[PDB]
Task: inverse folding
């Protein structure tokens, strides 16, 4: 009588058992082939203002005991009872200045254990048990001496400004050096000896080369793309370096985007980035309507027609550009169109967005920063917090490279559970379920410590899985009453 | 009292080779009582709307179609129709 | 303590009336200690510092929180303390009712009687917000404004409302 | 009383989506009651959206605001 | 709106308006004389000849560079702050001015 | 009354049914006084911008419609005193004009001016 | 296709009536979909009530019953 | 009072099962207050039903009816 | 499975609120268990909603304002 609905899920479970067997085998094989390998380690050294006293400056400010700042050497010399004590700009953590009408206070704070908060924590001092000068405050009268030249507080103000400038320059140079150390040098852009070269125009770039976005055009070269801003900022992206090419159309979006996930990081705008986007907007933003109102059958519907035409033209242009790049590269770089129907709401970086699974990468480009997960490197997936009284669950992507951090996607409507399972089943990915949230950090660390023992216990199969009953007894077999 | 005996009969009829737990039987009874109450409340609402003094098979069918989803409601309506036919037969 | 003793053994130390260490501030944000002086107050921070004369104070507001668990202590300033490209017109402090304290002034009994006219004592103890209110009152002479005869439907003394793209509490004083 | 949606387009949409059971008349009062209910419903939804936007600290409501409102509401 | 110099009033006798326009300092000039118009001019004063704000119309300009030129209305702004306008450009494309 | 007299000359619109000339703030707060139940113009600027139109000319100090040739000619004898106009160029949508006749409100063209 | 005929200015008017100080470009399609869903639910309920009442014409009373059932 | 008896780790575990990764210090008092309001409403409805039935003690059936009235049916105890 | 709220403190709170309502009352063990289950379910649902609000607010730390917004949008 019952509906009687069958379930291919059993076929899914069998396919998933096969995938789990293959996964265990391949994981064991790769870990046994690895068996530990070489590593890399660099050196470093603290900063020095002057290696010897002979390099000390000789300035009238120093002679008069005024807070001097040497820019070429990046040092700040301050008076300490007739002692011109120097400090490298790196020692100073920050500086502040206050005016109290009669006097001006200039405070200078250095780095020290406990105060090394932020991205400076890794800068472990060579001897944390020593005495660290944490604060030094100077006071200068604001009253101009009788017909003299400058005011004492003017010296403190000038010192504050110069120290801020030197600190800005020093931090800029340090950031540049730190981001250049570790870049994979890319080949030079083979200038287009070919006379054709497909090109596309009107494209805002992400991240921004300058402080704000830059409008520009793109040109497909023999071995890469060249992005040129309206001013002249040239950025190169070789084809061999492109790991994934995504094309997110404007069907239901405010921007038509071309996203490039690179295998190595390219440096531009004095910063290195792994993801790039070139988009064109087709949206509108207003207080509600146009702050006017009167829009009849001569601008409103006309505006809709214009918007549709612009969307269509941009879609056509993007498809033309894609086809030209493909034809020029001879299928060496293939673009991927994400399947919007197979998407689901997720929160990778804790921001509700619509992840879309292409055909070889789970992506999301409309929301910046981008999200990209290549399915070729996915070890497996785990659904945590999948119970009855929970309208949302989490997904955990474990990569083959155990030295990386697992990708955790929180808040996913339960209605989107079986679809994600079928998508993963088609992708040939093993998915398991878990009722509680596990400590993935400890799990991965333990697996890296004992991989063989891990497999001996069972490998990744660990994620997979008294009372009587009120039975119809003689007291239950009783009959009904009479009429 | 409860519908435990009837639930056990239906269970033996749909799967004559299986059992159940005490918590499972309790959950089934709670479900039976809740469905009964929902359908009865909807039927009372419809009867008060129609200004009738007797709940009828038509009222019950309307209540079922208002409560249960589409396919499930259609199957339940078919089962109830067959049952009432056999009863009146 | 050893360094302090070594310093005192050689120096000749001869001040602030009372020093509150680490008080939750909302505007500006962060933990700040407060040193009291006869004619101003020093708001010392981990980086930035300010000094507000009592002549710049306009009003002192002591307000409860909607949940009846915290207290807002607001100081209206004039001129507003400046910080680069921003000026603060109010100094807001947040306290907890269960946050007691025991303070001892850096003065003597007779001097306190002459200065505060008996409004304060050499040693005090009580709620932290109450202590701050009493001190600021005895210092500025301005009375601390308190909520009026308003009581919202939720029993709170304020209304939760938005303003300039930000949620907050509106108090009918 | 006040109606922002044009009654003719609204009626057209109702008869186009009421194809669950083809051929069914809708009284003028029935269409009016439906329009009033729809206007009130969208009004409440936008209020919740404004709350979500004010929470996110954005004066401009975005589709994710409405999505979150409906999710929390249980639609 | 077309006339600019004198206004009209509706009354039975002249003494009514004479005593009603007493004290005001603006109409002090036209106070010693009250003219009466025939009964035939009781309907031509309300006549307006073709407000004058409709899209897809033709309008002239009195400022800018396109002086004494006709142009087409494209998009009205009831906000009362701006308005679009179709007019062929008369510039030189930047090749005459230094 | 003091609620119908225009406050500021700048930003002023006029209706098309009874031709009620007032200020935008008055239209937003109070709205149309001569026709409110059959218009719902009150409570929002949206219906104001939808029905009324700033394309109008003429200003007359209407004070006695019951006894006035201008009111008898303009057909505003059954309206309250106020500042009206003599021409208003515009037309209401089909959906807005059909309900008037359906409920029992005769829609007439107040644009007494001529064309060419 | 009348979901598009629902004049976007109408949606903007409905939204502008309170608090909504600024709207994005995608709110229109989202609001249209939400209105479509609500209308589908209400009309399904009303059609069920009408088929129960046997009448071939949905009535304001049936609409009110559907709204009360949904809990609006 | 016993409202504070609700242990901080218990609220943290509830939030974890829900899906919260990081909790703030002001959350525990608020959660306790919300729980107190919900329990007060449920007990109000339950005592109303008990007075209706003229029983001396609240029963699992009365609690289930109160939960139904609130809109959160609970099986098992029927 | 297991209970997330401490049975004894929860039972004490239930008795406290019951005495506040009306003294000289008594509840059944199954009644107290059902109350605890309903309270845990309600709190978990509320926590899921608050986590959604925090996710939307572009944060990681849950806040009392998020709980308030969740309760508002729910309609309690
Ligand atoms: Zn009018």
Result:
């Amino acid at each position: 009588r019952t509906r009687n609905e069958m379930t291919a899920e059993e076929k899914r479970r069998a396919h998933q058992k096969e995938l789990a067997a293959q996964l265990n085998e391949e994981a064991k094989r790769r870990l046994t082939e690895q068996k530990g390998e070489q590593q890399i380690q660099k050196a470093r050294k603290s900063n020095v203002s002057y290696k010897n006293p002979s390099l000390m400056p000789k300035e009238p400010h120093i002679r008069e005991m005024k807070i001097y700042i040497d820019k070429k050497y990046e040092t700040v010399i301050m008076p300490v009872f007739g002692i011109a004590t120097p400090f490298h700009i790196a020692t100073i953590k920050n500086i502040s200045m206050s005016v109290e009408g009669d006097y001006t206070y200039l405070r200078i704070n250095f780095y020290c254990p406990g105060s090394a908060l932020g991205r400076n924590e890794g800068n472990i001092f060579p001897n944390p048990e020593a005495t660290f000068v944490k604060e030094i405050t100077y006071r200068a009268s604001n009253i101009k001496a009788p017909g003299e030249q400058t005011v004492p507080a003017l010296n403190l103000q000038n010192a504050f400004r110069i120290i801020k400038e030197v600190q800005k320059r020093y931090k800029t140079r340090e950031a540049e050096e730190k981001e250049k150390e570790g870049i994979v040098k890319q080949d030079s852009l083979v200038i287009n000896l070919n006379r054709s070269n497909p090109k596309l125009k009107d494209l805002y770039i992400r991240p921004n080369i300058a402080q704000k976005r830059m409008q520009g055009s793109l040109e497909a070269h023999v071995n890469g793309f060249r992005f040129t801003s309206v001013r002249g900022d040239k950025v190169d992206i070789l084809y061999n370096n492109i790991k994934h090419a995504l094309f997110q159309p404007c069907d239901g979006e405010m921007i038509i985007v071309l996203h490039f996930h690179l295998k190595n990081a390219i440096m531009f705008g004095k910063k290195r980035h792994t993801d790039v986007q070139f988009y064109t907007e087709v949206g509108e933003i207003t207080t509600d309507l146009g702050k006017h109102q009167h829009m009849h059958d001569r601008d409103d519907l006309y505006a809709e027609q214009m918007e549709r035409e612009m969307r269509h033209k941009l879609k056509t242009a993007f498809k033309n550009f894609i086809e030209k790049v493909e034809a020029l590269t001879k299928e060496e770089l293939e673009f991927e169109v994400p399947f919007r129907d197979l998407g689901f709401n997720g929160a990778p970086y804790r921001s509700t967005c619509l992840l879309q699974p292409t055909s070889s990468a789970l992506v999301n480009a409309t929301e910046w920063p981008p999200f990209v997960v290549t399915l070729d490197e996915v070890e497996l997936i785990h659904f945590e917090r999948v119970q009855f009284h929970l309208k949302n669950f989490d997904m955990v992507i474990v990569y083959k490279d155990y030295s990386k951090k697992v990708t955790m996607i929180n808040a996913i409507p339960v209605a989107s559970l079986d679809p994600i399972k079928e998508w993963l089943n088609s992708c040939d990915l093993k998915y398991t379920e878990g009722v509680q949230s596990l400590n993935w950090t400890k799990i991965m660390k333990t697996i890296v410590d004992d991989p063989e023992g891990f497999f001996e216990q069972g490998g990744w199969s660990f994620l997979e899985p008294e009372d009587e009953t009120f039975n119809p007894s003689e007291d239950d077999y009783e009959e009904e009453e009479e009429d | 009292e409860s519908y435990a005996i009837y639930v056990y009969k239906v269970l033996k009829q749909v799967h004559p080779d299986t059992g159940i737990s005490s918590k499972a039987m309790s959950i089934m009874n709670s479900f039976v009582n809740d469905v009964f109450e929902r359908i009865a409340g909807e039927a009372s609402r419809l009867a008060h709307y129609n200004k009738r003094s007797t709940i009828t098979s038509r009222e019950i069918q309307t209540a079922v179609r208002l409560l249960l989803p589409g396919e499930l409601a259609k199957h339940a309506v078919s089962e109830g129709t067959k049952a009432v036919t056999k009863y009146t037969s | 303590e050893a360094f302090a003793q070594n310093v005192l053994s050689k120096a000749d130390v001869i001040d602030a009336i009372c020093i509150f260490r680490e008080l939750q501030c909302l505007t500006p944000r962060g933990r700040y200690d407060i040193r009291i002086y006869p004619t101003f107050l020093h708001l010392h921070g981990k980086t930035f510092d300010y000094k507000i004369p009592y002549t710049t104070v306009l009003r002192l507001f002591l307000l409860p929180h909607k949940d009846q668990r915290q207290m807002f202590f607001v100081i209206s300033l004039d001129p507003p303390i400046k910080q680069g490209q921003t000026r603060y017109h109010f100094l807001i402090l947040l306290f907890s009712k269960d946050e007691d304290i025991s303070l001892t002034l850096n003065m003597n009994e007779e001097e306190v009687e002459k200065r505060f006219e008996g409004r304060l004592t050499k040693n005090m103890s009580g709620s932290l917000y109450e202590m701050v209110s009493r001190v600021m009152k005895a210092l500025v002479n301005r009375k601390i404004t308190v909520p009026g005869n308003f009581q919202g439907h939720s029993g709170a003394q304020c209304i939760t409302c938005s303003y300039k793209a930000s949620s907050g509490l509106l108090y009918p004083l | 009383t006040e109606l922002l949606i044009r009654k003719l387009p609204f009626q057209r949409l109702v008869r186009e989506i009421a194809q669950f059971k083809t051929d069914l008349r809708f009284q003028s009062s029935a269409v009016m009651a439906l329009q009033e209910a729809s206007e009130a419903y969208l009004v409440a939804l936008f209020e919740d959206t404004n709350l979500c936007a004010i929470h996110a600290k954005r004066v401009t409501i975005m589709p994710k605001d409405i999505q979150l409102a409906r999710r929390i509401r249980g639609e | 709106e077309h006339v600019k110099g004198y206004i009209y009033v509706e009354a039975y006798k002249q003494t009514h308006v004479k005593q009603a326009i007493e004290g005001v300092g603006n109409l002090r000039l036209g106070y010693w004389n009250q003219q009466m118009v025939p009964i035939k001019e009781m309907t031509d004063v309300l006549k307006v000849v073709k407000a004058n704000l409709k899209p897809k119309s033709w309008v002239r300009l009195k400022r800018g560079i396109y002086k004494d030129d006709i142009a087409q209305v494209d998009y009205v702004e009831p906000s009362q702050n701006t308005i679009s306008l179709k007019m062929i450009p008369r510039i030189d494309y930047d090749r005459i001015k230094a | 009354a003091l609620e119908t007299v225009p406050k500021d000359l700048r930003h002023l619109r006029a209706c098309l049914l009874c031709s009620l000339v007032k200020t935008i703030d008055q239209f937003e707060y109070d709205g149309c006084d001569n026709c409110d139940a059959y218009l719902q113009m009150k409570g929002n600027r949206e219906m104001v911008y939808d029905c009324t139109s700033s394309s109008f000319d003429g200003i007359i100090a209407m004070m006695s419609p019951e006894d006035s040739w201008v009111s008898k000619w303009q057909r505003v004898s059954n309206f309250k005193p106020g500042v009206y106009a003599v021409s208003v160029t515009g037309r209401l949508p089909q959906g807005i004009v059909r309900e008037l006749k359906s409920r029992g409100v005769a829609y007439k063209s107040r644009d007494t001016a001529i064309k060419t | 296709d009348n979901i598009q005929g629902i004049t976007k200015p109408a949606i903007r008017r409905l939204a502008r009536r309170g608090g909504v100080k600024r709207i994005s470009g995608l709110i229109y399609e989202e609001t249209r979909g939400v209105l479509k869903v609500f209308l589908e639910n209400v009309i399904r309920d009303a059609v069920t009530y009408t088929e129960h009442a046997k009448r071939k014409t949905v009535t304001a009373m049936d609409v009110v019953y559907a709204l009360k059932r949904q809990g609006r």
Observations:
- Residues F 15, 17-18, 20, 32, 34-35 surround zinc ion (CB under 6 Å).
